[PDB]
């Protein structure tokens, strides 16, 4: 599809059989979610955006689905304020940005 | 043009007669650069990303060219850890996400 910016674009994603809104944000490096709980052993990290950086729980090798597009990928946890999709697992589901 | 990525969206700008370098974010509800001196008066703001907020400098109406393509609107200045066209230049230029 075709996404306008006017307004955020959010879309439903799917991971560990739950449904989640998440933002496709292309200035975010990695993707990182609200607190949840996920399959496999994790490492931590410190990811740093606009405020500071945060303390976020590492797993890779994590299936999501989004907007019905399968990707694999490394899926961050932690006290984010909104879901966001980064350039990761954009990538994969062959999200460009156009103009 | 069509911008994948596999890296980050770094595009030149031109603003107040300078190059410089910016992310353009779909993740950016506005557009945010590094400190810089602007024309006219400012008006507070407050902008939160994932770690936390900051304070910038608003300036209204301002000049800024983005890979050739020209906009003039609001440009938020402050302690940002790099350039950022946010949505509100982006729509202005046509830009969407497409996948
Ligand atoms: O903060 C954000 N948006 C806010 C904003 C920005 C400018 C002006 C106004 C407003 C309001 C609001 O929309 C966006 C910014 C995000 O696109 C990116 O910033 C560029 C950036 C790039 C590199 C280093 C630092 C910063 C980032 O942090 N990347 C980092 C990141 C994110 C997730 C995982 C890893 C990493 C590493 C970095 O790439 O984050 C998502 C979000 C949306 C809404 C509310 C909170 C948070």
């Not at 399959?39 to 090798?61: A, E, H, L, N």
Request: glycine share 14%; with cysteine; proline share 6%.
């Amino acid at each position: 599809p075709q996404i306008t910016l006017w307004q955020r674009p959010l879309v439903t994603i799917k991971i560990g059989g739950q449904l989640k809104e998440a933002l496709l944000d292309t200035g975010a490096d990695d993707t990182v979610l609200e607190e949840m709980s996920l399959p496999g052993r994790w490492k931590p990290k410190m990811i740093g955006g606009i405020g500071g950086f945060i303390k976020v729980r590492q797993y890779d090798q994590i299936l999501i689905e989004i907007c019905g597009h399968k990707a694999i990928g490394t899926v961050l946890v932690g006290p984010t304020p909104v879901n966001i999709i980064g350039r990761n697992l954009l990538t994969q589901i062959g999200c460009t940005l156009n103009f």
